[PDB]
Design a protein around this ligand. Structure first.
Ligand SMILES: Nc1ncnc2c1ncn2[C@@H]1O[C@H](COP(=O)(O)OP(=O)(O)OP(=O)(O)O)[C@@H](O)[C@H]1O
Ligand SMILES: Nc1ncnc2c1ncn2[C@@H]1O[C@H](COP(=O)(O)OP(=O)(O)O)[C@@H](O)[C@H]1O
Ligand SMILES: [Mg+2]
Lengths: 80, 465, 1411
């Protein structure tokens, strides 16, 4: 959903002690010991362009390409 | 290793693509790794050819005869296109093009330049299709593993063997257990009692070490995802457990098995199809176990039905020429036919002439029940015309005549006589056209079509990668 | 449980249990008492069973105990009534005797048993003939007794007939066999009903034999059900059923719907003395209820049929299918008790389960695996028809039933092979059952003969055939069988038809009489009629003419309700239920029936009621009526009722196509296919003239009228026009409308133009008079055939007109007109004389400003003439071609008409049209039209519907909004959608503009709507008029710089050259949004003025650069990429060099000319260095004061900031930014908005957001802009537009400057109220409702600023933004799509400004950025 949105762009209103972020309606306090990660299971799924541009996209995927890399390790152990 | 590496992805891509077409056709990366380790225990050229061979040896088992030959033509092109000449590449492709309806042309000839390839076009040009399709298999120079071999080599306690509804490897598994290590337990999954007894015999056989079978799981499936899915996954103590092997029978055409359970277990495809005479001998074979409620005369009718059933089943495979669509006929269809036969003799005189409504009821209710197309409904009937009405001499097939029961009237002796008529006969090479009254010209049309289907799906696969 | 609790509670009463019996028996409806004793029961069919022993009842008796006796006795009672009867017939008693004394179920079984016994013996003897005639006699005897019988016993005879017929048929078939073996085969296939004359326990005494297999008749009461006619196919079904059961298997038949799979299972039950429980599975059916029923069935030993089993939800289907296996496995084995639903319940072995499998979208459905070895699957097929036909003929009163049946079938079968394969042609049995149904009343007229058959064939088959196939029917009907020479009712109806049309204005053509005849004869039989044909066939004329002829012939009045079917929703029409309170309110179709059915307070018995559906017909709507189309003649509510329909009440369907409707729907109704137009082109005109003359009688004296109708006759003869209408085709017609349907546009115009100059006809020369007539007719005839043409084509057609009219007769010229003096009668023909406009600098941009042209006046004249005719006009043409101005100017000028603008979009509703009207309209309930909706003020109203070929269409493909206008144009009122009556719109006109429908976006409109419009194609003007027009525009703005008065022509000529080239160089082929028009020119002209009106004294070097900056912002800001952007730089250079030759120019690239009022008090070109610093000081501030987000100010940003600034400064400021992502299009907007002092509103949407949320966000921003004077900037991102409506809202917000739906009804009154408060506060009271709204709207138009930020325009959701007209026309499109190499390096530089680095090889920092 769009509401996380301001939390994805690192946007805030700085205050006397508090750091406030607008979520949907209520302005809520950010800790700073707070961390955020987003997890997805299907690479068929397409994420919104707003997110995809501000998000560090990392693929933990067990590919067909992964075979090429892994066959050499097994080959070399039985060749040299 | 890059030269080894580039080939192996394109191989995995191909085996992966079968899993897209069909659910049972799955392959993990681990399965490909484990297979490539087996390849060890011009150096690069031999190791490469060792890969293509070992992949064909292990993954040929989990596919059906069509996809065996698709993978054969493909894998052959995956090797030889990189390895041999460019003169070679368009020559073999111009041949695969003729088998398919893509194009028909004559490949590049150099005297003694290519001999294996000179031999292949001879198969394609002789309009001999099945031979040309197998050419690609044989060129691999692999010993093609029997279910037993596969099982023996295999180092897992689980197996799921799917098959077309025409057959069931249940009886193959009986002789497979008998020839080595015994311990056979057949378990139907039917009604709460069967599943309930079943789950009891599952936990106990693994501690005991007996072989177990789960017949036609697909029907009791809702249970599988809940009990069996978790049970087989949890049983990495089955590694701890006594030498024991669990077997599961599937149907390819049918409900999709849970992929996680399926990929964890080894996979085979019974593809093993009996001749007419052997099915006749196998139908007639059990029939003596029933005992006696009827006359000697009936056994003649039950013999007739044995032939009949074995003749419709034979025809079921060859479509379109043959039947319009695939119909499946069962031991249920024989059972319901036999029961009407006992009933017609139980209600009528032993005068032979009751014959007329025997045909109508066999050809329109018992067997014509599932038949919907008018075209095929006539075929069942025209078979009944031939199989049932006979006077004195029938001549079911051109080799074999069945004479009507003799005055001696021995029920012992007529069984033995009708078994004898089987043992006298030798099933001709051309059975499908001689015995099933359809033309030879039709059979070749069919052979062509399954060729075209292998040839197409291969071209398609190569262009995709 | 609920019902069970009532029964235990109602034990006291006893009588109250009878309600629940209908349920727990199936067959019976209520129980009969003598208070202490039960005398018997009655079935749902009406039939009354009396028990042998009347069951005694006492206080201390349980329901359980007394009813259990009843079930026993009801079965016993049936055996008694069976043996009583069987015995009687055996003792030679007339079957007509037995009928009156024995319940059907008893006599049926007695029949079967005696029949069988008599045919069983008859097979040995071969005395078939003796018994056959014998049986045939009983058939005839039963038939005629039926005509004089009481309705109850009428069912019983009929139901027996089904059986007797079967008896004879089988004997027949037996008599005929080649051999005895052939006969003994046939007999085995049949159900043979035996009794055991050996044994005790009589309810087990009857059994049934089939295929060798036997089956005990259980003695359940069945009542008298509608009995299925026996077919070979039928017996077969019964045969498989018995064959499954005999081996303890379940029966299952799959096959397509309508093959009567469950009906079979039901019928097979009844034949064996069983009432089958039918489970309709997945009619949102509870599993919990079925689970109960299954236990009940296994206990009671009943038969249960799963009606359409396959369509159940997979978790339910698993659960059920597993349960069923228990039952089927319990029986196969014979388990005493089986366990199902986690309890040990017993199994009756008499139990059986039946499964019907309708096919899916995939194919013919399958049983779950487990059920495959538990059931026997069978393929139901439609019956080969011959067999069904014979019987039906037998039942009616046969004559020769065998001959007719064979001949009827062969014919139908033949038509199929012989006629053309045409969409709606059905020659299947449905159709022959129809021909046969239609036959029964016809027999009443003639005979139970072939002749009655032959008539019914042409009565149904022919009215549906089209001309080629119309003879194949006749050729092969007489080829197969010939019946008669002469027709009854031949003279009588015809004179009542001719007299109807003479009166109505029509001509009695060979075709119109035919299609009138076909109709007449079909009402008679059929209650639902369909009339299909091209728009302007003559349907509404045919039926309106025939119905009218029947009030002359019968003397019966009619009451017609013509309803446009698809203007209203299923809910508006049939009856809609409200989601929580479940409150039932009427609708439209149901409501007009209740005047006839519920309260026939006036004369309705003697009247005829016709409900016409003029609109397109669709499945969704007919399905909700299918029961009235059925033999039922009753209307089924979604909840609450069935309403019965009288024989008076006839439903017609008038429509153009059938493609959507099902063959099923056709074959219940009578179909009347209109092959071609009923009437001659002449004959149409004829009627059309007289129709127009009638109008004038109410406003023109007989002497005047007589003379004007004389003129018309002599000026245009048919002979001339015939070639002219043929030449019409040989042209390019935009928004194609056929020649026939253009006629009304001629005649209405022609009559109006001649009636116009009536005073100058009194005294003028009779030779000269002809010339005024001939000219006007030549002109009216041009716009009505060529008005929608290129005009390059018009001019071509003009000579074509003159050619075929008399050569000497007054010629038509391109600009041809008739002129008369102010204060004197004068005559002469002069053309193309034009005013000149002088306007000041301020006036230059004004939403209503037209510089009159040779074509402004041309168009405006015709356009106004058509309204005087009062025919709806459709103005079709390219964007900016002036359709809207021409239409607006012509009417903002006159006192007579007053305009209301409705802008249409992809999805506009028919209430939107109404809401727009509600401000300018005043309902009055005058008894003249009942409710009326006439303009609020006394003078005429014009609704201008812009973008009429924008609204979309149902999934069938039907735009209702358009049918709604069609409704208004043709019908002249409309039906009120919730409140339910007819309001007749008074003196409101319909006008519409629209783009060529070859254009993208565009939807093709129904010729049934466009036939009612005059179509005028307006294209672009000249490139020479454009140059002329904008000169006069520059003239006005150069009153501000008078020293360059000589420079206005080269500026106007340059602006047009720039336009001509941009339009040609940047086309929709490169990019969609490359769409230019004279709007851009006008935009540029004004853009220039505003810069002057607020700039320092201008040198010619200033002015050209001033013009160049505007030229950039209007034409090139939208350009993507750089090949094209450089192309424009050189174009602008190419144009200055050709029109403004100076060596004082500089770099014309947009980076070098930067114009602003941010530094200066006046709008001036500013310095690059002065600006960047100005932004730097302002961005820190904006960064500090408002959201903290850091960015690097680069050359492109300054250029972009100015872009948004000019946009956000203009009155209506709309910009849509296309910026890829991270470009900063959203951030710069927030900035420039803050510099301009604009409140940034940014719709707060999310995954869960409703339209109402977005509605709220909009409403506030609007209310704050007028009633708080807010000056807001609305930033809408592509992400915000969640649904289609959201974007529709955004459109309404730009094309109009309000959202009407937000402020409607009482929320309208609250707004209206608040508005008065603030208006006074500022210093004016505004008197009228319109005065205030126009301020409200005008305030929004100047305070609301919508900026759109769309990232990938390639995306199909973001495509729809740019697509939408409203957005595209009112927005300033800007392109930010890629970061250029220069701007990248500039940004990189400032980011690596921090210096950890130290000197290296080569610069060091320069190299890192380049990498
Ligand atoms: N006998 C006749 N003489 C003169 N004119 C006729 C005659 N019959 C029909 N017309 C003309 O044809 C028109 C009939 O309109 P009608 O509504 O029947 O057309 P339609 O085919 O139903 O169009 P749509 O399909 O859009 O409803 C009338 O306007 C009338 O001018
Ligand atoms: N005679 C004229 N005088 C002034 N402007 C004109 C004239 N003819 C055309 N135009 C210009 O062309 C545009 C007409 O387009 P528009 O009013 O949107 O018509 P439509 O809605 O049919 O496209 C206007 O913006 C106007 O500036
Ligand atoms: Mg009409």
């Amino acid at each position: 959903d769009p509401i996380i949105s301001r939390l994805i762009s690192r946007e805030f209103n700085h205050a006397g002690n508090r750091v406030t972020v607008e979520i949907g309606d209520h302005e809520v306090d950010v800790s700073g010991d707070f961390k955020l990660f987003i997890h997805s299971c299907d690479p068929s799924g397409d994420i919104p362009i707003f997110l995809r541009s501000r998000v560090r996209l990392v693929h933990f995927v067990t590919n067909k390409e992964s075979i090429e890399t892994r066959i050499f390790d097994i080959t070399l152990t039985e060749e040299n | 290793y890059s030269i080894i590496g580039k080939h192996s992805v394109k191989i995995f891509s191909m085996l992966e693509k079968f899993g897209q077409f069909h659910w049972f056709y799955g392959i993990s990366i681990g399965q490909f790794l484990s297979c490539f380790k087996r390849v060890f225990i011009t150096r690069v050229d031999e190791i490469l050819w060792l890969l293509y061979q070992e992949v064909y040896c292990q993954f040929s088992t989990a596919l059906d005869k069509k996809f065996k030959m698709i993978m054969a033509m493909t894998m052959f092109c995956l090797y030889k296109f990189d390895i041999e000449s460019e003169q070679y590449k368009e020559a073999v492709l111009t041949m695969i093009g003729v088998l398919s309806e893509s194009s028909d042309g004559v490949p590049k000839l150099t005297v003694d330049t290519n001999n294996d390839l000179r031999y292949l076009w001879d198969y394609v040009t002789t309009k001999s299709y099945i031979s040309a399709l197998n050419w690609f298999k044989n060129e691999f120079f692999v010993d093609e593993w029997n279910i037993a071999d596969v099982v023996a080599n295999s180092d897992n306690n689980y197996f799921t063997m799917a098959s077309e509804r025409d057959v069931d490897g249940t009886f193959k598994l009986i002789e497979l257990a008998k020839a080595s290590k015994e311990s056979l337990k057949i378990i139907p999954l039917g009604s709460i009692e069967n599943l309930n007894y079943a789950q009891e015999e599952i936990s106990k056989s693994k501690i005991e070490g007996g072989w177990i079978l789960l017949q036609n799981i697909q029907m009791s499936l809702s249970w599988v995802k809940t009990y069996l899915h978790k049970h087989v996954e949890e049983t990495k103590a089955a590694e701890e457990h006594e030498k024991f092997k669990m077997f599961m029978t599937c149907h390819l055409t049918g409900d999709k098995l849970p992929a996680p359970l399926l990929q964890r277990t080894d996979r085979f495809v019974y593809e093993d199809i009996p001749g007419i005479l052997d099915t006749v001998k196998d139908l007639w074979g059990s029939q003596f176990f029933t005992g006696k409620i009827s006359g000697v005369w009936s056994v003649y009718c039950t013999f007739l039905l044995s032939w009949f059933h074995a003749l419709i089943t034979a025809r079921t495979r060859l479509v379109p020429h043959g039947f319009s669509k695939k119909y499946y006929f069962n031991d249920c269809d024989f059972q319901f036919a036999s029961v009407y036969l006992e009933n017609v003799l139980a209600t009528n005189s032993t005068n032979n002439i009751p014959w007329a409504q025997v045909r109508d009821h066999i050809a329109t209710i018992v067997y014509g029940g599932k038949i919907d197309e008018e075209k095929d409904l006539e075929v069942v009937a025209k078979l009944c015309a031939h199989v049932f009405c006979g006077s004195d001499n029938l001549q079911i097939v051109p080799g074999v005549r069945i004479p009507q029961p003799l005055l001696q009237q021995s029920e012992e002796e007529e069984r033995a006589r009708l078994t004898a008529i089987l043992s006298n006969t030798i099933e001709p090479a051309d059975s499908l056209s001689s015995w099933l009254q359809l033309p030879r010209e039709s059979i070749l049309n069919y052979e062509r079509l399954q060729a075209k289907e292998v040839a197409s799906s291969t071209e398609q696969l190569l262009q995709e990668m | 449980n609920d019902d069970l609790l009532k029964i235990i509670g109602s034990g006291k009463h006893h009588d109250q249990v009878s309600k629940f019996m209908k349920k727990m028996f199936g067959s019976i409806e209520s129980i009969i008492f003598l208070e202490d004793f039960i005398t018997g029961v009655r079935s749902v069919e009406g039939e009354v069973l009396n028990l042998n022993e009347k069951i005694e009842l006492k206080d201390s008796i349980q329901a359980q105990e007394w009813l259990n006796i009843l079930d026993t006795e009801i079965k016993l009672s049936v055996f008694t009534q069976f043996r009583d009867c069987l015995g009687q017939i055996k003792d030679g008693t007339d079957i007509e005797v037995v009928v009156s004394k024995y319940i059907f179920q008893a006599i049926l079984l007695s029949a079967q048993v005696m029949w069988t016994e008599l045919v069983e013996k008859c097979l040995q003897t071969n005395q078939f003939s003796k018994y056959w005639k014998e049986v045939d006699m009983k058939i005839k005897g039963l038939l005629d007794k039926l005509n004089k019988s009481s309705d109850n016993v009428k069912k019983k005879i009929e139901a027996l007939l089904v059986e007797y017929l079967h008896f004879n048929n089988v004997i027949g078939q037996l008599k005929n066999c080649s051999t005895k073996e052939e006969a003994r085969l046939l007999w085995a296939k049949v159900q043979k009903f035996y009794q055991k004359n050996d044994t005790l326990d009589d309810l087990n005494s009857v059994f049934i034999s089939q295929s060798g297999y036997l089956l005990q008749y259980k003695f359940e009461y069945i009542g008298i059900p509608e009995r299925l006619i026996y077919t070979p196919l039928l017996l077969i079904g019964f045969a498989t059923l018995t064959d499954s059961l005999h081996q303890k298997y379940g029966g299952c038949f799959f096959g397509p719907a309508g093959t009567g799979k469950t009906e079979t299972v039901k019928a097979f039950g009844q034949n064996l003395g069983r009432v089958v429980v039918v489970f309709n599975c997945d009619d949102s059916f509870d599993y919990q209820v079925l689970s109960r029923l299954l236990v009940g069935i296994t206990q009671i030993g009943a038969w249960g049929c799963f009606d359409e089993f396959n369509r159940l939800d997979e978790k339910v289907l698993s659960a059920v299918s597993a349960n069923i296996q228990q039952i089927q496995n319990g029986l196969q084995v014979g388990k005493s008790h089986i366990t199902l639903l986690e309890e040990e319940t017993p199994l009756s072995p008499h139990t059986a389960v039946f499964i019907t499998l309708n096919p899916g979208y995939n194919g013919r459905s399958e049983l779950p695996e487990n059920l495959k070895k538990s059931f026997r699957e069978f393929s139901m097929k439609s019956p080969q028809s011959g067999t069904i036909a014979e019987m039906i003929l037998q039942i009616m009163g046969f004559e020769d039933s065998k001959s007719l049946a064979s001949k009827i079938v062969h014919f139908l079968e033949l038509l199929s092979s012989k006629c053309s394969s045409m969409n709606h042609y059905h020659f299947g049995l449905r159709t022959l059952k129809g021909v046969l149904r239609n036959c029964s009343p016809l027999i009443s007229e003639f005979g139970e003969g072939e002749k009655t058959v032959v008539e019914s064939l042409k009565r149904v088959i022919l009215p549906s055939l089209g001309d080629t196939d119309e003879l194949v029917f006749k050729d092969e009907l007489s080829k197969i069988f010939d019946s008669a020479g002469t027709p009854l009712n031949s003279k009588a109806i015809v004179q009542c038809l001719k007299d109807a049309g003479q009166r109505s204005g029509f001509s009695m053509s060979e075709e119109f009489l035919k299609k009138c005849m076909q109709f007449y004869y079909m009402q008679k039989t059929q209650q639902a009629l369909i009339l299909v044909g091209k728009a302007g066939c003559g349907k509404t004329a045919t039926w309106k003419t025939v119905i009218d002829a029947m009030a002359i012939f019968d003397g019966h009045a009619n009451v017609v309700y013509v309803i446009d079917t698809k203007v209203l929703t299923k809910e508006s029409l049939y009856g809609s239920m409200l989601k929580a309170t479940l409150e039932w309110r009427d609708g439209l179709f149901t409501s007009i029936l209740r005047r006839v059915n519920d309260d026939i307070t006036g004369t309705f018995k003697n009247s005829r009621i016709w409900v016409v559906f003029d609109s397109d017909l669709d499945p969704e709507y007919v399905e909700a009526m299918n029961s009235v189309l059925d033999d039922n003649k009753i209307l089924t509510l979604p909840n609450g009722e069935r309403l019965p329909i009288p024989p008076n009440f006839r439903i017609l369907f008038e429509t153009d196509n059938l493609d959507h409707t099902t063959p099923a729907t056709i074959t219940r109704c009578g179909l009347l296919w209109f092959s071609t137009d009923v009437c001659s082109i002449s004959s149409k005109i004829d009627h059309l003239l007289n129709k127009s003359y009638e109008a004038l009688d109410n406003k023109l004296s007989m002497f005047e009228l007589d003379k004007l109708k004389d003129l018309i006759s002599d000026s245009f003869d048919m002979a001339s026009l015939t070639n002219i209408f043929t030449c019409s085709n040989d042209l390019v017609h935009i928004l194609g409308v056929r020649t026939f349907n253009k006629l009304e546009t001629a005649v209405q115009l022609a009559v109006h133009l001649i009636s116009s100059y009536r005073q100058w006809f009194q005294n003028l020369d009779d030779k000269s008079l002809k010339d005024v007539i001939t000219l006007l007719i030549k002109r009216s005839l041009l716009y009505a055939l060529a008005g929608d043409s290129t005009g390059e084509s018009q001019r071509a057609f003009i000579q074509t007109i003159n050619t075929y009219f008399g050569h000497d007769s007054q010629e038509l010229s391109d600009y041809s007109t008739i002129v008369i003096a102010n204060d004197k009668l004068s005559f002469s023909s002069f053309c193309s004389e034009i005013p000149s406009v002088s306007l000041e600098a301020h006036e230059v941009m004004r939403p209503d400003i037209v510089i009159p042209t040779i074509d402004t006046i041309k168009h405006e004249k015709i356009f106004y003439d058509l309204l005087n005719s009062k025919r709806g006009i459709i103005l079709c043409g390219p964007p900016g071609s002036g359709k809207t101005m021409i239409m607006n100017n012509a009417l903002r000028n006159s006192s007579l008409y007053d305009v209301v603008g409705i802008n249409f979009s992809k999805d506009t509703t028919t209430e939107h049209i109404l809401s727009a009207l509600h401000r300018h309209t005043n309902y009055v309930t005058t008894s003249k039209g009942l409710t009326l909706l006439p303009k609020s003020d006394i003078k005429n109203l014009v609704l201008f519907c812009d973008e009429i070929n924008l609204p979309k269409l149902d999934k069938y493909g039907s735009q209702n909004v358009v049918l709604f206008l069609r409704q208004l144009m043709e019908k002249q009122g409309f039906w009120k959608t919730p409140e339910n009556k007819w309001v007749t719109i008074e003196r409101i006109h319909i006008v519409g503009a629209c783009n060529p429908p070859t254009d993208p976006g565009r939807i093709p409109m129904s010729e049934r709507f466009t036939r009612h419009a005059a179509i005028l194609y307006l294209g672009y003007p000249s490139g020479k008029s454009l140059s002329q027009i904008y000169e006069i525009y520059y003239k006005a703005i150069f009153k501000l710089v008078p020293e360059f008065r000589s420079y206005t022509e080269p500026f106007a000529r340059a602006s047009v050259h720039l336009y001509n080239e941009c339009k040609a160089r940047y086309s929709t082929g490169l990019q969609s949004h490359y769409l230019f028009s004279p709007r851009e020119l006008t935009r540029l002209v004004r853009g220039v003025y505003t810069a002057i009106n607020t700039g320092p004294r201008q040198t010619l070097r200033s002015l050209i650069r001033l013009w160049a900056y505007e030229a950039w912002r209007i034409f090139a800001d939208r350009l993507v990429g750089v090949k094209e952007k450089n192309s424009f730089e050189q174009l602008l250079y190419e144009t200055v060099d050709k029109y403004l030759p100076n060596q004082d120019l500089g770099n014309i690239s947009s980076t070098s000319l930067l114009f602003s009022g941010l530094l200066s008090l006046d709008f001036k070109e500013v310095n690059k260095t002065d600006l960047v610093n100005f932004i730097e000081e302002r961005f820190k501030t904006f960064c500090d004061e408002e959201l903290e987000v850091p960015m690097v100010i680069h050359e492109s940003m300054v250029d972009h900031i100015l872009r948004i600034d000019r946009a956000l400064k203009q009155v209506q400021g709309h910009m849509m930014l296309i910026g890829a992502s991270r470009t900063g299009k959203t951030i710069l907007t927030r900035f420039v908005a803050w510099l301009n002092g604009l409140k940034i509103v940014q719709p707060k949407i999310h995954r869960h957001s409703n339209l109402s949320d977005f509605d709220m966000i909009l409403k506030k921003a609007i209310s704050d802009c007028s009633l708080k004077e807010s000056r807001t900037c609305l930033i809408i991102d592509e992400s915000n537009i969640l649904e289609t409506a959201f974007l529709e809202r955004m459109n309404t917000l730009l094309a109009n400057a309000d959202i009407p739906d937000l402020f409607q009804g009482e929320e309208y009154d609250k707004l209206l109220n608040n508005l008065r408060n603030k208006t006074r506060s500022l210093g004016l009271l505004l008197d009228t409702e319109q005065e205030l709204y126009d301020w409200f709207v005008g305030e929004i138009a100047k305070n609301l600023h919508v900026v759109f930020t769309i990232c990938d325009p390639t995306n199909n959701k973001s495509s729809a933004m740019i697509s939408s007209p409203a957005l595209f026309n009112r927005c300033i499109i800007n392109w930010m799509g890629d970061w250029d190499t220069k701007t990248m390096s500039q940004v990189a530089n400032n980011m690596v400004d921090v210096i950890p680095m130290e000197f290296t090889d080569f610069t060091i920092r320069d190299a890192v950025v380049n990498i």
